[PDB]
């Protein structure tokens, strides 16, 4: 029963509640949460109504309890292994990123063109790089159902389609291209132009 | 007044409307927009009630007129020049990104440690790299926005340096909460939280 726009804030509330927990805060008000997130307290309260919590009275939401609620809903106690497709400027950078404090989110497999110089190599942390033509062979017995897509924009749709045929069910795409994929496939876009336009909008509201 | 959570979608609506316009769609429904964005029609309808005559009906939204609305509210007809601070794995990647079709959003200079090999040089697309100690010298400038891609351990210190030099907004990639003055805006790119969102949605499809 959580609305989709509220669900897109789960992971942000999780981050903030872990911080508040680490800071020894027992009860967090809607205004403190809003301020941390850069939204309005009214949106916070409505959102939290879907998490079982009223926010109109009392001293705040129970930090430990909610933190644990977010952890459970985001499946933060189990591991998700993802593949990275396109090991160029941004893809190579992402191989260096620590996605999770407890390694519950990891890149476990990467792909590039069969002829790319990285193909055949393995990272310091044991992520092999394969050719894209081998993807179906590698995904046969695999636990990976999630891909990060960092190919050139001109190639994103074609590679996305390859991924879905291979069994990928969700894609975190960095290309600024709308992907047309089947309805049961989730695509999450990282759009840094849209992030900067947001930022600038808020900067202009402060002036 | 547009609520802050609605304002965080302006840029997303702008992308969608530019696509619909390019595709020759004259009128869009709340459901078509919601499906594009991956949210609920009801959220779209409420948001658009804050966009004036153009969104009051809750249906048949005029694509060209709303695209123009979003371009105006986002100041998409003028140029924003930004600086990048930290030319490492992700910083160097970003210097290769084309942020805007019409170059209205651009990285115009970058910074690293004074001792970094890239300092004194120019990137592929001819962006100059300077040492962080010289930031206040470089900032007579039109730049009031930074992208922050230093190590996580250095993010707060470098953020403080930016704010002292005159930066008013920071797009941060470090998974570190920054404590800065109220009048400084920080937008956090948090790839962990993006992937958690994606997996939540994937689990809802099963
Ligand atoms: N550069 C950035 O930091 C940044 C930021 C945001 C978005 N983006 C977007 O991310 C995408 C990639 O950008 P980039 O600058 O890293 O591109 P890039 O050109 O450096 O790298 C793309 C990689 O994908 C590989 N590739 C090409 N076809 C492939 C295929 N069929 N299968 C597997 N791999 C294939 C290439 O060999 C290359 O290694 C682009 O759409 C870009 O717009 C980049
Ligand atoms: N690797 C990724 O793709 C990725 C993705 C998401 C988030 N992040 C985050 O982005 C940040 C940077 O990651 P990275 O792997 O690119 O780090 P990195 O160590 O490769 O790069 C950091 C750069 O910052 C420079 N630097 C250090 N102190 C500085 C200072 N005082 N002033 C100016 N420059 C300074 C360094 O010389 C170096 O070039 C980290 O917080 C990381 O968690 C990285
Ligand atoms: Cl949203
Ligand atoms: Mg909302
Ligand atoms: Mg997780
Ligand atoms: Mg090849
Ligand atoms: Mg979505
Ligand atoms: Mg590009
Ligand atoms: Mg653009
Ligand atoms: Mg189910």
* Distance, first Cα to last Cα, chain A: 39
A11 burial (CB, 10 Å; 0-12 / 13-18 / 19+) is buried
C-alpha dist (Å) from residue B5 to A20, A40, A183, B191, B198: 21, 7, 26, 20, 19
In the beta sheet, which residues pair with residue A28?
Answer: A61
Question: Which chain B residue shows the shortest CA-CA distance from A44?
Answer: B5
Half-sphere exposure of B118 (CA within 13 A, CB side): 22
For A105-114, b/e burial (b = at least 16 CB within 10 A) is bbbbbbbbbe
C-alpha dist (Å) from residue A123 to A87, A107, A118: 12, 11, 10
Experimental method: X-ray
DSSP A26-40: SEE-HHHHHHHHTS-
**Closest ligand to residue A39's CA:** 4
Determine the topology of domain A73-207 in CATH: Rossmann fold (3.40.50)
Phi, psi for B111 (deg, rounded to 5): -140, 145
Rounded to 5°, angle at Cα B139 from B137 and B143: 160
* Biggest CA-to-CA distance, chain A: 62
Interface test mutation site (partner B, options A200, A202, A205, max chain B beta carbons within 10 A): A200
Distance CA B53, CA B151 (A): 47
Instruction: Sketch the domain layout of chain B as residue ranges.
Output: 1-72, 73-206
Which chain B residues are within 8 Å of A171, Cβ to Cβ? 198
Q: Is A196 in the pocket of ligand 1 (CB under 6 A)?
A: no
Neighbours of A97 (CB within 10 A): 14
CA-based nearest distance B133→chain A, Å: 25
Interface test mutation site (partner B, options A3, A6, A7, A8, max chain B beta carbons within 10 A): A8
In angstroms, how far is CA B136 from the centroid of its own chain?
24
Tokens of residue A175, six digits: 């290309």
Q: Is A91 in the pocket of ligand 1 (CB under 6 A)?
A: yes
Distance CA A171, CA A149 (A): 7
DSSP chain B: ---HHHHTTHHHHHHHHHHHHHTT--EE-HHHHHHHHTS-HHHHHHHHHTTGGGTTTSSSEEHHHHHHHHHHHTTTTS-EEEEEE--SHHHHHHTT----TTSSEEEEEEEE-TTSTTTT-B-TT--BEEEGGGHHHH---S--EEEE-S-GGGHHHHHHHHHHHT--EEEE-SSS-----TTSEEEE--HHHHHHHHHHHHHHH-
Distance CA B98, CA B87 (A): 16
User: Residue B75 contacts by C-beta under 8 Å, 6 or more apart in sequence?
Assistant: A200, A204
**Closest ligand to residue B205's CA:** 10
Neighbours of A90 (CB within 10 A): 23
The radius of gyration of chain B's CA atoms, rounded to the nearest angstrom, is: 20
Ligand 1: which of A91, A112, A151, A188 to mutate, judged by most atoms within 8 Å of the beta carbon? A151
Query: Is A88 assigned to a binding site?
Result: yes
Tokens of residue B168, six digits: 């008013």
Distance CA A160, CA A147 (A): 9
In angstroms, how far is CA B105 from the centroid of its own chain?
9
Q: In this structure, which CATH number among 3.40.109.10, 3.40.50.720, 3.30.360.10, 3.20.20.10 belongs to the domain B73-206?
A: 3.40.50.720
> Could you tell me how many residues make up chain A?
207
A32 burial (CB, 10 Å; 0-12 / 13-18 / 19+) is middle
Task: Give the position of tokens 């309005």.
Answer: A40
Distance CA B20, CA B185 (A): 31
A73 with B200: Cβ contact below 8 A:
yes
Task: Give the position of tokens 């939401």.
Answer: A61
Q: Are B174 and B148 in contact (CB under 8 A)?
A: yes
B187 with A169: Cβ contact below 8 A:
no
Tokens of residue A184, six digits: 């049961």
Q: What's the CATH class of domain B1-72?
A: mainly alpha
Q: Which atom of ligand 1 is nearest to the CA of A131?
A: 33
Q: Are A146 and B202 in contact (CB under 8 A)?
A: yes
In the beta sheet, which residues pair with residue B128?
Answer: B122
B192 with A43: Cβ contact below 8 A:
no
């Amino acid at each position: 029963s959580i609305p989709k726009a509220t669900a897109k804030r789960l992971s942000l509330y999780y981050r903030i509640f872990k911080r508040f927990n680490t800071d020894g805060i027992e009860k967090a008000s809607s205004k403190q949460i809003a301020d941390a997130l850069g939204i309005d307290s009214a949106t916070v309260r409505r959102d939290f109504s879907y998490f079982g919590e009223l926010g109109r009275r009392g001293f705040g939401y129970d930090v430990k309890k909610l933190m644990n609620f977010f952890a459970e809903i985001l499946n933060d106690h189990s591991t998700t292994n993802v593949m990275l497709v396109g090991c160029g400027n941004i893809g190579r950078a992402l191989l260096h990123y620590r996605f999770h404090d407890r390694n519950k989110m990891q890149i476990s497999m990467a792909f590039d063109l069969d002829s790319n110089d990285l193909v055949g190599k393995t990272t310091e942390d044991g992520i092999p790089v394969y050719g894209i033509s081998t993807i179906n062979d590698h995904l046969i017995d695999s636990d990976i159902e999630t891909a990060i897509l960092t190919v050139p924009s001109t190639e994103a749709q074609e590679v996305a389609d390859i991924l879905v045929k291979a069994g990928i069910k969700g894609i975190l795409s960095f290309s600024p291209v709308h992907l047309t994929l089947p309805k049961d496939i989730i695509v999450q876009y990282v759009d840094l132009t849209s992030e900067l336009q947001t930022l600038l909008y808020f900067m202009n509201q402060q002036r």
